[PDB]
Amino acid sequence: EFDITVVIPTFKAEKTVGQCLESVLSQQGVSTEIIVVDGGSPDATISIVQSFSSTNLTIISEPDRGIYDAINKGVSRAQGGMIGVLGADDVYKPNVLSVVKENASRGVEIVAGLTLIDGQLRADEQYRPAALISGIPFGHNAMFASQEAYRKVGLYDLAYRICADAEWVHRAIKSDISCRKVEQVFVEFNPEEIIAEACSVIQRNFPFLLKEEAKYLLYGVRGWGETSRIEQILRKYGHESVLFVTALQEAFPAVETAAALEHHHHH
Numbered sequence: 001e002f003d004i005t006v007v008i009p010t011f012k013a014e015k016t017v018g019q020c021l022e023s024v025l026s027q028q029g030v031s032t033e034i035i036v037v038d039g040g041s042p043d044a045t046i047s048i049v050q051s052f053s054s055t056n057l058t059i060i061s062e063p064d065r066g067i068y069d070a071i072n073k074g075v076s077r078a079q080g081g082m083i084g085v086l087g088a089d090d091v092y093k094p095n096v097l098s099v100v101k102e103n104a105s106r107g108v109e110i111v112a113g114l115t116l117i118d119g120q121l122r123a124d125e126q127y128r129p130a131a132l133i134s135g136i137p138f139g140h141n142a143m144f145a146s147q148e149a150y151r152k153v154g155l156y157d158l159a160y161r162i163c164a165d166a167e168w169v170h171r172a173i174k175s176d177i178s179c180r181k182v183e184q185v186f187v188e189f190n191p192e193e194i195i196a197e198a199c200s201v202i203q204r205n206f207p208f209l210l211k212e213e214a215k216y217l218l219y220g221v222r223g224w225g226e227t228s229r230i231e232q233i234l235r236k237y238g239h240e241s242v243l244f245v246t247a248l249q250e251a252f253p254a255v256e257t258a259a260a261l262e263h264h265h266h267h
């Protein structure tokens with residue numbers, strides 16, 4: 001019954017939840033359902049959320065196991081054609097929801113836009129196998145996914161408290177979920193732990209990789225580290241997976257002559 005469902009997880013968000021919801025309620029040209037999944041805030045959050053138009057607004061307020069648990073509860077209740085997730089410190093830009101509706105009209109399963117972070121565009125990557133040796137290719141809050149996308153991919157993996165968004169998108173890529181990237185800003189707003197989860201997520205695509213080899217690939221694609229061992233890694237594991245060969249030749253087009261050699265002998 002709704003073009004869009006916006007899932008907003010909140011805990012102690014009294015400072016910004018107003019600005020967040022104003023960015024959703026003011027969206028013109030769409031029927032929007034809002035599901036606020038609050039983890040039991042003791043501050044003004046519940047009152048502020050209640051100060052908005054409640055017509056299509058549901059409030060869940062109960063303990064949960066973290067951000068992605070709250071997101072899962074909201075996604076599970078969503079009735080909209082496309083489902084977005086907005087943090088309480090985030091805002092959608094004007095007209096974004098209508099842009100999502102328009103770009104979804106042919107049945108694409110994911111519609112993703114750009115993200116503005118401290119006045120700079122997030123350095124996004126393409127939605128393609130090459131993302132599988134990296135992080136999430138677009139900002140998770142700039143992503144909208146259909147009911148069928150979530151039905152087919154499933155829910156967010158709570159084992160990942162940082163990078164569950166990346167792991168979900170990688171599962172989408174591996175499931176050949178369709179995606180359309182829109183070159184418009186949709187949303188504005190312990191490294192060792194982040195790196196550990198990101199390596200783990202990459203290894204869930206390619207279980208033959210050592211953690212250090214997942215790290216090398218990740219730093220390689222992101223431009224944080226050198227790439228002279230990429231060909232070595234390709235020769236080491238190319239026989240394991242055509243997807244992995246495809247990912248490396250997409251991420252590092254210069255290894256094409258070596259990639260074709262892997263394809264030719266094993267795939």
Ligand SMILES: Nc1nc2c(ncn2[C@@H]2O[C@H](COP(=O)(O)OP(=O)(O)O)[C@@H](O)[C@H]2O)c(=O)[nH]1
Nearest residue numbers: 009010011013037038039066067070087088089
């Ligand atoms: N329901 C729920 N929401 C949370 C929890 N922790 C954080 N949040 C909310 O999740 C959103 C993002 O949290 P934040 O600390 O900014 O993490 P980040 O934006 O993903 O880096 C905000 O809307 C918070 O209110 C939690 O344990 N439960």
